[PDB]
Design an enzyme around this catalytic site. Structure first.
Site, PDB file in Angstrom:
ATOM      1  N   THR A  43      -9.429   3.899   6.029  1.00 35.80           N
ATOM      2  CA  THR A  43     -10.243   3.058   5.119  1.00 35.80           C
ATOM      3  C   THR A  43      -9.318   2.196   4.248  1.00 35.80           C
ATOM      4  O   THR A  43      -9.528   0.980   4.162  1.00 35.80           O
ATOM      5  CB  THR A  43     -11.216   3.920   4.311  1.00 35.80           C
ATOM      6  OG1 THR A  43     -10.591   5.093   3.792  1.00 35.80           O
ATOM      7  CG2 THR A  43     -12.438   4.258   5.132  1.00 35.80           C
ATOM      8  N   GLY A  44      -8.311   2.796   3.635  1.00 33.07           N
ATOM      9  CA  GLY A  44      -7.291   2.043   2.884  1.00 33.07           C
ATOM     10  C   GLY A  44      -6.595   1.010   3.741  1.00 33.07           C
ATOM     11  O   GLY A  44      -6.371  -0.140   3.278  1.00 33.07           O
ATOM     12  N   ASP A  45      -6.227   1.381   4.960  1.00 35.58           N
ATOM     13  CA  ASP A  45      -5.482   0.471   5.855  1.00 35.58           C
ATOM     14  C   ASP A  45      -6.339  -0.750   6.176  1.00 35.58           C
ATOM     15  O   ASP A  45      -5.804  -1.886   6.151  1.00 35.58           O
ATOM     16  CB  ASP A  45      -5.005   1.186   7.109  1.00 35.58           C
ATOM     17  CG  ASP A  45      -4.075   2.343   6.815  1.00 35.58           C
ATOM     18  OD1 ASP A  45      -3.273   2.254   5.861  1.00 35.58           O
ATOM     19  OD2 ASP A  45      -4.160   3.336   7.555  1.00 35.58           O
ATOM     20  N   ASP A  69       0.890  -1.181   0.000  1.00 39.11           N
ATOM     21  CA  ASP A  69       0.000   0.000   0.000  1.00 39.11           C
ATOM     22  C   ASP A  69       0.914   1.214   0.000  1.00 39.11           C
ATOM     23  O   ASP A  69       1.522   1.515   1.005  1.00 39.11           O
ATOM     24  CB  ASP A  69      -0.927  -0.010   1.203  1.00 39.11           C
ATOM     25  CG  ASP A  69      -1.928   1.119   1.235  1.00 39.11           C
ATOM     26  OD1 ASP A  69      -1.882   1.928   0.312  1.00 39.11           O
ATOM     27  OD2 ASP A  69      -2.778   1.152   2.173  1.00 39.11           O
ATOM     28  N   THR A  75      -2.118  -1.527  -3.735  1.00 42.45           N
ATOM     29  CA  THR A  75      -3.479  -1.043  -3.377  1.00 42.45           C
ATOM     30  C   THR A  75      -3.464   0.475  -3.252  1.00 42.45           C
ATOM     31  O   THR A  75      -3.911   1.027  -2.267  1.00 42.45           O
ATOM     32  CB  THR A  75      -3.942  -1.698  -2.072  1.00 42.45           C
ATOM     33  OG1 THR A  75      -3.084  -1.303  -0.986  1.00 42.45           O
ATOM     34  CG2 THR A  75      -3.966  -3.195  -2.212  1.00 42.45           C
ATOM     35  N   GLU A  90     -21.146  10.384   2.010  1.00 48.37           N
ATOM     36  CA  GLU A  90     -20.691  11.796   2.154  1.00 48.37           C
ATOM     37  C   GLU A  90     -19.789  11.859   3.394  1.00 48.37           C
ATOM     38  O   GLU A  90     -20.078  11.160   4.390  1.00 48.37           O
ATOM     39  CB  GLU A  90     -21.879  12.765   2.243  1.00 48.37           C
TER      40      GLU A  90
HETATM   41  N1  LIG Z   1     -16.680   7.964   1.326  1.00 52.26           N
HETATM   42  C1  LIG Z   1     -16.674   6.661   1.068  1.00 52.26           C
HETATM   43  N2  LIG Z   1     -17.827   6.053   0.693  1.00 52.26           N
HETATM   44  C2  LIG Z   1     -17.789   4.740   0.403  1.00 52.26           C
HETATM   45  N3  LIG Z   1     -16.774   3.876   0.495  1.00 52.26           N
HETATM   46  C3  LIG Z   1     -15.652   4.510   0.881  1.00 52.26           C
HETATM   47  C4  LIG Z   1     -15.521   5.850   1.187  1.00 52.26           C
HETATM   48  N4  LIG Z   1     -14.211   6.142   1.554  1.00 52.26           N
HETATM   49  C5  LIG Z   1     -13.597   4.981   1.505  1.00 52.26           C
HETATM   50  N5  LIG Z   1     -14.410   3.956   1.094  1.00 52.26           N
HETATM   51  C6  LIG Z   1     -14.104   2.545   0.998  1.00 52.26           C
HETATM   52  O1  LIG Z   1     -12.810   2.341   1.519  1.00 52.26           O
HETATM   53  C7  LIG Z   1     -11.953   1.790   0.503  1.00 52.26           C
HETATM   54  C8  LIG Z   1     -10.598   2.413   0.643  1.00 52.26           C
HETATM   55  O2  LIG Z   1     -10.780   3.822   0.594  1.00 52.26           O
HETATM   56  P1  LIG Z   1      -9.903   4.691  -0.428  1.00 52.26           P
HETATM   57  O3  LIG Z   1     -10.290   6.098  -0.265  1.00 52.26           O
HETATM   58  O4  LIG Z   1      -9.978   4.115  -1.803  1.00 52.26           O
HETATM   59  O5  LIG Z   1      -8.429   4.512   0.182  1.00 52.26           O
HETATM   60  P2  LIG Z   1      -7.587   5.492   1.219  1.00 52.26           P
HETATM   61  O6  LIG Z   1      -8.402   5.443   2.518  1.00 52.26           O
HETATM   62  O7  LIG Z   1      -6.262   4.806   1.234  1.00 52.26           O
HETATM   63  O8  LIG Z   1      -7.415   6.858   0.594  1.00 52.26           O
HETATM   64  C9  LIG Z   1     -12.670   2.055  -0.824  1.00 52.26           C
HETATM   65  O9  LIG Z   1     -12.360   1.041  -1.770  1.00 52.26           O
HETATM   66  C10 LIG Z   1     -14.140   1.968  -0.417  1.00 52.26           C
HETATM   67  O10 LIG Z   1     -14.565   0.626  -0.341  1.00 52.26           O
HETATM   68  C1  LIG Z   2      -4.529  11.135   7.452  1.00 49.30           C
HETATM   69  O1  LIG Z   2      -3.625  10.264   8.130  1.00 49.30           O
HETATM   70  C2  LIG Z   2      -2.796   9.554   7.236  1.00 49.30           C
HETATM   71  C3  LIG Z   2      -2.120   8.440   7.983  1.00 49.30           C
HETATM   72  C4  LIG Z   2      -2.326   7.090   7.600  1.00 49.30           C
HETATM   73  C5  LIG Z   2      -3.158   6.693   6.370  1.00 49.30           C
HETATM   74  O2  LIG Z   2      -4.529   7.131   6.126  1.00 49.30           O
HETATM   75  C6  LIG Z   2      -1.600   6.136   8.332  1.00 49.30           C
HETATM   76  N1  LIG Z   2      -0.779   6.427   9.375  1.00 49.30           N
HETATM   77  C7  LIG Z   2      -0.625   7.705   9.749  1.00 49.30           C
HETATM   78  C8  LIG Z   2       0.301   8.046  10.877  1.00 49.30           C
HETATM   79  C9  LIG Z   2      -1.254   8.744   9.033  1.00 49.30           C
HETATM   80  O3  LIG Z   2      -1.085  10.051   9.441  1.00 49.30           O
HETATM   81 CA   LIG Z   3      -4.374   5.242   2.215  1.00 47.91          CA
HETATM   82 CA   LIG Z   4      -9.181   9.632   3.680  1.00 46.80          CA
END
Ligand SMILES: Nc1ncnc2c1ncn2[C@@H]1O[C@H](COP(=O)(O)OP(=O)(O)O)[C@@H](O)[C@H]1O
Ligand SMILES: COCc1c(CO)cnc(C)c1O
Ligand SMILES: [Ca+2]
Ligand SMILES: [Ca+2]
Ligand SMILES: Nc1ncnc2c1ncn2[C@@H]1O[C@H](COP(=O)(O)OP(=O)(O)O)[C@@H](O)[C@H]1O
Ligand SMILES: COCc1c(CO)cnc(C)c1O
Ligand SMILES: [Ca+2]
Ligand SMILES: [Ca+2]
Ligand SMILES: [Ca+2]
Ligand SMILES: [Ca+2]
Ligand SMILES: [Ca+2]
Ligand SMILES: [Cl-]
Lengths: 294, 290
Positions: free
Chosen positions: A221-223, A116, A146, A215
């Protein structure tokens, strides 16, 4: 086989990095060996962030403990997230290679490295500039990537604005040497679309799907998504693993909104409710469809 | 409501400190806010230990971020374990006092400070020297203390070898200022197949005491204290302290038996029976003494 070396942040308050990834992986029956790249009060969204950051020396010191105790052959999976240190990002390739060598010497199946490339979100880099290039170099050694659409955009230099542009960004990753890429979400303003791209053959199998757009801006969410993806991919084909990980995120974002983390709430309110519904981390209430592209 | 500040170790490999404590508390619905006093490769029983140890400035820097974002009134519970640093041990007193203040200002229930005075086991002081005196000072401010028999003995200067001596050691903790004491296990010359525990509750100046036993299982374990204190915080949130000790004892008995049927091998299998962490197969009897 269910042993992960997870190289991500530690925060005292809230749910990002290893705190967010660890609980889901443990519920799925994995031993999570965490190397904490930072040990901070909270995520970078708060007006104040305090605490300790690893340098390369701290990382190679932990690695020496793992090496000397013969733990490296344990790691069937390597998962990297927040590092925000060029030297440590570069050092991950040697770490993974050393794990692959320890596993082969023990007659174990090869490890799977999930990267990631944590650099930024909502159009802002929250990690240093030199780190972008170090990720391009590390990704040549990753089995699965990812990126969010911001990270995919800055790595590939392609503005990911739609499915077509997601595909050009993913093709860059494959050319770089990453076989499997998930672009987790991108722009029907009520839904987000995602891309799974798998390069063997020289052929690429591609899949898409959608999830409801909630919204508000979430963190972690990514983690949770990458941790979920490792857990499901251990005993699902990657398309199903993506769909199940998307379902886990839907349940967690809905629980967060229900406990009062709407668009207009505080950052504390919007922290993912990672511990609220443990059963729904293993068995989400919905599984997103992941449908082949022609 | 169910929010714990947990000041203990992190290890990459295995299950001690915040690695033993966090998953159980999370399973019980608690948000665990961990300050990792060290970040090491593994526990102190392996041939090689490597990693980072906090200094006082690192601790007070984290506190600065928690203070600045107004998180301190969140901590209904403070749980301390492995620190092995005299300056941080002493600083915990100020950290608890600042949490107590933040919660009182906000009209929340008094915080409960669970102090596990992590210093050694198996007759060996695996932590530093003047850490002992620092824990005697810190224990003046604890709500609950959960020493093992070695720690109870070194802190009170009473060799805890039976129920009479466990009560003398507990009484010392009450005099120092800790109202509630669990001496988690001690061997009995006169009952070799059992471990005995004591729960001692100073009020009126009166002391309610409770005891019971568990089977003395073969071998040596790590993480047992850390999972015990975490489980005790979980159960004591809704249960009276006697029933809470009983359930925590049951949890440990399931984990040790689950470890026995599965150093790397004697690691506690903390995440293997998540059901047994919430609902142990049996509770230990925790019976009042007359
Ligand atoms: N506002 C949102 N509404 C719906 N699903 C979301 C939303 N934010 C994140 N997700 C979900 O979390 C996953 C990871 O979020 P994403 O924004 O793509 O990664 P990151 O949190 O790393 O920026 C997405 O694939 C989706 O399933
Ligand atoms: C907005 O915070 C970003 C962040 C993330 C990944 O979303 C993960 N670890 C730390 C320590 C961070 O600060
Ligand atoms: Ca992320
Ligand atoms: Ca975010
Ligand atoms: N050999 C053993 N047999 C049975 N129970 C044990 C054994 N070792 C530990 N325990 C259990 O784990 C709990 C904590 O272990 P203890 O040794 O008292 O503390 P620590 O691990 O801090 O030294 C005990 O109260 C008991 O329930
Ligand atoms: C078994 O080693 C003791 C120990 C404990 C208490 O179990 C906690 N944390 C660390 C870092 C330790 O080394
Ligand atoms: Ca995002
Ligand atoms: Ca490659
Ligand atoms: Ca012991
Ligand atoms: Ca022990
Ligand atoms: Ca202990
Ligand atoms: Cl006795």
């Amino acid at each position: 086989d269910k042993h992960v070396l997870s190289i991500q942040s530690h925060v005292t308050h809230g749910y990002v990095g290893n705190k967010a990834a660890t609980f889901p992986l443990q519920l799925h029956g994995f031993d999570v060996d965490a190397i904490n790249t930072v040990s901070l009060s909270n995520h970078s969204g708060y007006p104040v962030i305090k605490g300790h950051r690893m340098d390369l020396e701290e990382f190679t010191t932990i690695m020496e403990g793992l090496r000397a105790n013969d733990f490296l052959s344990d790691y069937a999976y390597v998962l990297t997230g927040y590092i925000n240190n060029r030297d440590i990002v570069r050092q991950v390739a040697a770490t993974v290679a050393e794990i692959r060598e320890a596993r082969q010497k023990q007659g174990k199946k090869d490890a799977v490295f999930f990267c990631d490339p944590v650099m930024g979100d909502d159009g802002r880099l929250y990690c240093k500039e030199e780190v972008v290039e170090a990720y391009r170099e590390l990704l040549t050694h990753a089995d699965v990537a990812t990126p969010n659409y911001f990270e995919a955009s800055i790595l590939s230099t392609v503005e990911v604005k739609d499915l077509a542009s997601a595909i050009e960004a993913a093709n860059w990753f494959h050319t770089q040497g990453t076989p499997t890429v998930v672009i987790k979400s991108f722009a029907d303003p009520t839904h987000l679309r995602f891309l799974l791209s798998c390069r063997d053959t020289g052929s690429t199998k591609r899949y898409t799907g959608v999830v409801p757009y909630h919204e508000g801006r979430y963190t972690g969410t990514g983690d949770v998504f990458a941790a979920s993806l490792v857990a499901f991919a251990h005993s699902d084909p990657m398309d199903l693993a993506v769909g199940k990980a998307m379902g886990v995120l839907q349940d967690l974002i809905k629980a967060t909104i229900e406990r009062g983390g709407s668009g207009k709430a505080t950052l504390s309110s919007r922290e993912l409710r990672v511990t609220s519904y443990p059963d729904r981390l293993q068995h989400p209430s919905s599984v997103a469809l992941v449908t082949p592209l022609p």
